[PDB]
Design an enzyme around this catalytic site. Structure first.
Site, PDB file in Angstrom:
ATOM      1  N   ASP A 160     -12.139  -3.112  -9.104  1.00  0.00           N
ATOM      2  CA  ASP A 160     -11.147  -2.307  -9.807  1.00  0.00           C
ATOM      3  C   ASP A 160     -10.039  -3.187 -10.379  1.00  0.00           C
ATOM      4  O   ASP A 160      -9.031  -3.440  -9.719  1.00  0.00           O
ATOM      5  CB  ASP A 160     -10.549  -1.261  -8.865  1.00  0.00           C
ATOM      6  CG  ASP A 160     -10.962   0.151  -9.230  1.00  0.00           C
ATOM      7  OD1 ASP A 160     -12.143   0.351  -9.585  1.00  0.00           O
ATOM      8  OD2 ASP A 160     -10.105   1.056  -9.161  1.00  0.00           O
TER       9      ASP A 160
ATOM     10  N   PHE B  40       0.827  -1.201   0.000  1.00  0.00           N
ATOM     11  CA  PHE B  40       0.000   0.000   0.000  1.00  0.00           C
ATOM     12  C   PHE B  40       0.866   1.257   0.000  1.00  0.00           C
ATOM     13  O   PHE B  40       0.435   2.321   0.442  1.00  0.00           O
ATOM     14  CB  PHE B  40      -0.928   0.006   1.216  1.00  0.00           C
ATOM     15  CG  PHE B  40      -2.385   0.067   0.858  1.00  0.00           C
ATOM     16  CD1 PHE B  40      -3.098  -1.093   0.604  1.00  0.00           C
ATOM     17  CD2 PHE B  40      -3.042   1.283   0.777  1.00  0.00           C
ATOM     18  CE1 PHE B  40      -4.439  -1.041   0.273  1.00  0.00           C
ATOM     19  CE2 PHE B  40      -4.383   1.343   0.448  1.00  0.00           C
ATOM     20  CZ  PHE B  40      -5.082   0.179   0.196  1.00  0.00           C
TER      21      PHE B  40
END
Length: 360
Positions: free
Chosen positions: A177, A48
């Site tokens: 996504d 991340f």
């Protein structure tokens, strides 16, 4: 009598140096396994953001420079909580190989897990997790390569993403996504694509039980409409039809290297009008984008078929995989050996939290 006006700004500074306040490379992070993992050079990718290698030194017989890394996240336990949950829940050599081999799955496009840990920075608990060694990104490679990939790659990726998309879709989460931002490769291995950034996990069916279209009437917009497709863009859960549809859009975009609606994806209204207009006769649109450059058919039929069944009737992995492998192999080519995305780009992927109710 014209009228113009605008403005902007931004900045950020920081620094420190003193005992119990000056971490750096080589630092030892204690995991839940009561161990000590040494942090290696910086990466920024593989989790991340702000990811640092792991297992610098050796404990017993070096294993290829110890291909391992460790991602670091802020003291929130929001996105990392969900991502790590499923990540570790679906992470395992025996477990994966067990069901995978028992179901003859086309391998699992997921990163390997080893352990996790958190370091209390006196008021700020920094959470981190160790995973495979990554470095490349599908979001960067396509950027420099202008999404100029061959059919072999599009097919390989689609297949992998499909298998994993199903294994997870049968649980309670789906990466609406499909953006390349969620697709990352090995630190230096093009023949291995792993899908990370589970932060975009969207609960497919509530309590494990599907539900008629009526989840987010205000467009959950879990991610970028560019790849979020009408499904996520409408807040509705991609009950198979959505997942497949998305894969088809990104597939043709990768083989074409350019999208018509994409340039107009800046707004939702456009993306919608495009999806519908193109949905009316995806076949014509697919063949229109490619007059005679290669052989537009696998994606054309795949999509048409996905929408030929219904908006939410039932999935067709076998059927889809059939037409895909048929058109891809029809040219007498298939499985070149691994992949065709060894352009070596290495950039900075992205991510986001799950849509529902928390973003303050």
């Amino acid at each position: 009598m014209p009228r113009v006006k605008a403005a902007q700004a931004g900045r950020q500074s920081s620094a420190k140096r003193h005992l119990a306040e000056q971490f750096a490379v080589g630092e030892i992070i204690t995991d839940m396994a009561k161990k000590e993992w040494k942090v290696g050079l910086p990466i920024g990718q593989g989790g991340f953001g702000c990811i640092y290698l792991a297992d610098m030194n050796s404990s017993e017989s070096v294993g290829s420079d110890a291909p391992c890394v460790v991602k670091v996240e802020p003291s929130d336990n929001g996105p990392l909580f969900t991502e790590l949950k499923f990540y570790q829940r679906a992470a395992k050599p025996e477990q994966i190989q067990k069901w995978i081999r028992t179901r003859k799955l086309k391998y699992l496009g997921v990163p390997k897990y080893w352990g996790s840990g958190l370091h209390d920075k006196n008021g700020k608990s920094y959470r981190f997790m160790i995973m495979d060694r990554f470095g490349s990104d599908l979001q960067k490679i396509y950027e420099a390569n202008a999404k100029r990939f061959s059919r072999k790659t599009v097919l390989q990726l689609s297949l992998r993403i499909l298998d994993i998309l199903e294994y997870i879709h049968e649980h309670e989460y789906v990466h609406g996504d499909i953006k390349a931002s969620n697709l990352l490769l090995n630190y230096k291995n093009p023949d291995q694509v792993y899908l990370v950034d589970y932060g975009l996990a969207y609960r497919y069916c509530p309590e494990g039980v599907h539900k008629e279209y009526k989840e987010d009437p205000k467009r959950c917009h879990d991610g970028t409409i560019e790849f979020t497709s009408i499904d996520a863009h409408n807040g509705v859960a991609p009950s198979r039809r959505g997942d497949l549809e998305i894969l088809g859009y990104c597939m043709i975009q990768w083989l074409t290297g350019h999208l018509p609606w994409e340039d107009n994806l800046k707004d939702p209204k456009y993306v919608r009008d495009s999806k519908i207009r193109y949905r009316e006769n995806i076949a014509s649109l697919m063949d229109k984008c490619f007059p005679e450059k290669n052989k537009p058919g696998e994606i054309a039929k795949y999509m048409e078929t996905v929408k030929l069944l219904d908006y939410t009737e039932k999935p067709l992995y076998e059927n889809l995989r059939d037409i895909l492998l048929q058109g891809l192999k029809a040219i007498g080519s298939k499985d070149d050996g691994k992949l065709d995305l060894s352009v070596v780009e290495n950039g900075g992927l992205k991510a986001k939290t799950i849509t529902k109710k928390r973003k303050k």
